[PDB]
Amino acid sequence: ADINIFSVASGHLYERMLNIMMVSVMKHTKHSVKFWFIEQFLSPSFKKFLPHLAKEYGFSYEMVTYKWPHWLRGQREKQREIWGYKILFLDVLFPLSLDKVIFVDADQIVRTDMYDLVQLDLEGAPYGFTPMCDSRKEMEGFRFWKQGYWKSHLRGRPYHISALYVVDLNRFRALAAGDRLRGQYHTLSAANLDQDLPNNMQAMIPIKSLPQEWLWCETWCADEDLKTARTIDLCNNPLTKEPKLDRARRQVPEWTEYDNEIAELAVRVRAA
Ligand SMILES: O=c1ccn([C@@H]2O[C@H](COP(=O)(O)OP(=O)(O)O[C@H]3O[C@H](CO)[C@@H](O)[C@H](O)[C@H]3O)[C@@H](O)[C@H]2O)c(=O)[nH]1
Numbered sequence: 001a002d003i004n005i006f007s008v009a010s011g012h013l014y015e016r017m018l019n020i021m022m023v024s025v026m027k028h029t030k031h032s033v034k035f036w037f038i039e040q041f042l043s044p045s046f047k048k049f050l051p052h053l054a055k056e057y058g059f060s061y062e063m064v065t066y067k068w069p070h071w072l073r074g075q076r077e078k079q080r081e082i083w084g085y086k087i088l089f090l091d092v093l094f095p096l097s098l099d100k101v102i103f104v105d106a107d108q109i110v111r112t113d114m115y116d117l118v119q120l121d122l123e124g125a126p127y128g129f130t131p132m133c134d135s136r137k138e139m140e141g142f143r144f145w146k147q148g149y150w151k152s153h154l155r156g157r158p159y160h161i162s163a164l165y166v167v168d169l170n171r172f173r174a175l176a177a178g179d180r181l182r183g184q185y186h187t188l189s190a191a192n193l194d195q196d197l198p199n200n201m202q203a204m205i206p207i208k209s210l211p212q213e214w215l216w217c218e219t220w221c222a223d224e225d226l227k228t229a230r231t232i233d234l235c236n237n238p239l240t241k242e243p244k245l246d247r248a249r250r251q252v253p254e255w256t257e258y259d260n261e262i263a264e265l266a267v268r269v270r271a272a
């Protein structure tokens with residue numbers, strides 16, 4: 001397919017949002033799209049509905065059955081296991097026939113043609129991530145990456161949010177980035193695994209910083225930049241603690257539209 005998107009998450013609300021993420025992608029492209037999931041992290045109900053969603057919205061999909069290898073230290077906590085599946089297996093989840101894959105968070109709403117991200121020049125980097133926004137200045141106290149360990153360690157590189165990333169799998173494989181990430185994981189495994197690990201290894205495994213418009217989250221990013229945002233992440237706000245759905249329905253007018261459309265499809269599938 002032209003566009004290849006990977007997502008992984010757990011839970012009922014995240015499955016509901018995952019369907020909305022997929023629909024949002026299809027509403028903004030005419031290029032072909034394949035979604036890649038990890039079989040064990042989708043509920044039976046989700047897996048039964050998926051072929052119906054695919055036929056309605058004109059995408060293909062694959063459920064991968066890759067299991068955490070015995071030689072790699074596991075994670076007892078589900079959230080951390082899922083973070084491992086996001087970042088530790090990019091060279092092994094996907095076949096060598098695949099040139100590129102994009103991780104999109106299940107809570108995202110896309111407002112752009114994702115083929116633009118496929119075509120974006122990564123300047124030799126094995127992957128590209130969006131920097132955390134500086135624009136909402138009133139949240140500076142929560143920008144942990146601008147002080148202490150991160151300020152000195154980054155030596156002027158951005159700290160990037162892990163909600164969205166494009167992986168040039170040819171470059172990633174050539175650099176043995178998967179081995180390098182797993183190697184650092186083993187050393188460090190003796191906080192936010194999916195985000196801290198790639199941000200920590202930029203000197204060895206570089207990140208191309210995507211233009212800021214690629215990922216807007218209200219927590220970090222100014223109101224004025226919503227109108228130009230290509231994708232929205234519903235990232236949590238440590239100040240307000242505003243609930244996830246309230247953020248979704250408040251921030252994103254089309255969220256309800258997509259949710260309703262999918263629900264109506266489910267009603268018809270069940271009626272038949
Ligand atoms: O019901 C849930 C709740 C969370 N998660 C996952 O748990 C992590 C934390 O997510 P969440 O509590 O919703 O916070 P967010 O603020 O949306 O997460 C932001 O920060 C995380 C790193 O801390 C990144 O993984 C996300 O991409 C980024 O959007 C993420 O991997 C989620 O996908 C689930 O799978 N199911």
Ligand SMILES: [Ca+2]
Binds near residue numbers: 108233234
């Ligand atoms: Ca998110």
